[PDB]
Design a protein around this nucleic acid. Structure first.
Ligand SMILES: [Zn+2]
Length: 196
RNA sequence: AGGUAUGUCUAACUUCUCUUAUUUACAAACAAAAUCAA
């Protein structure tokens, strides 16, 4: 569960840490220096991190820094769709555009009970800091998801591309987020999802 | 030769409740079984 990381003792006088918080004191137990909470096992440590308590102390420490100045029934065939990445350009910079194609009424003929069928594909930017394997990380992914088909990701080394500035005139139908409404199109008649 | 006089030149701002559950460690040289004319 430790994912092979080495947490140095508090007295070893600090290699960069994943979270520079959880330590081991003079004794063998694990502690959160901010929260000042002792934890028996790494599982308890992860409960602490996933707990609201630790988070509140993180926000308090950030304030100190500024001062110092449906999920169940989800069908899953895990089928990799076909993406068509292509370097785009407009004006005045460079942006990316993806063309994802979906089934041709091949298997979607057995499921038509208006169960989120009206819901279009959704995209989100995920940090690689969390993976099923947790080995390497440090870059973002433009994940795209649809109920039956399997998720898809696209690595984005560049810190920022096509991140525009008030493209439209501030109209508020949040849909899912500014990203989706701002720059996505869902040709539902042909089943083609464009993203740029 | 000496002395005097005159002139000219040259130098010098401090003292992290409750609740009900789950997770995980730990303590007590804690106790370990059988036999019974016990
Ligand atoms: Zn903490």
């Amino acid at each position: 569960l430790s994912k092979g990381e080495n947490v140095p003792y508090t007295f070893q006088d600090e290699q960069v840490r994943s979270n520079p918080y959880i330590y081991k004191n003079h004794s063998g137990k694990l502690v959160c220096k901010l929260c000042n909470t002792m934890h028996m096992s790494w599982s308890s440590v992860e409960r602490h991190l996933g707990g609201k308590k630790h988070g509140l102390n993180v926000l308090r420490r950030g304030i100190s820094i500024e001062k110092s100045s449906x999920x169940x029934x989800x069908x899953x065939x895990x089928x990799x769709x076909x993406x068509x990445x292509x370097x785009x350009x407009x004006x005045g910079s460079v942006g990316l555009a993806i063309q994802v194609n979906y089934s041709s009424e091949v298997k979607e003929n057995s499921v038509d009970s208006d169960d989120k069928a009206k819901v279009p594909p959704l995209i989100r930017i995920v940090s690689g800091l969390e993976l099923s394997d947790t080995k390497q990380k440090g870059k973002k992914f433009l994940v795209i998801a649809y109920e039956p088909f399997e998720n898809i990701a696209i690595e984005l080394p560049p810190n920022e591309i096509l991140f525009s500035e008030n493209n439209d005139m501030d109209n508020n139908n949040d849909g899912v987020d500014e990203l989706n409404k701002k720059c996505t199109f869902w040709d539902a008649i042909s089943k083609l999802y464009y993203v740029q």
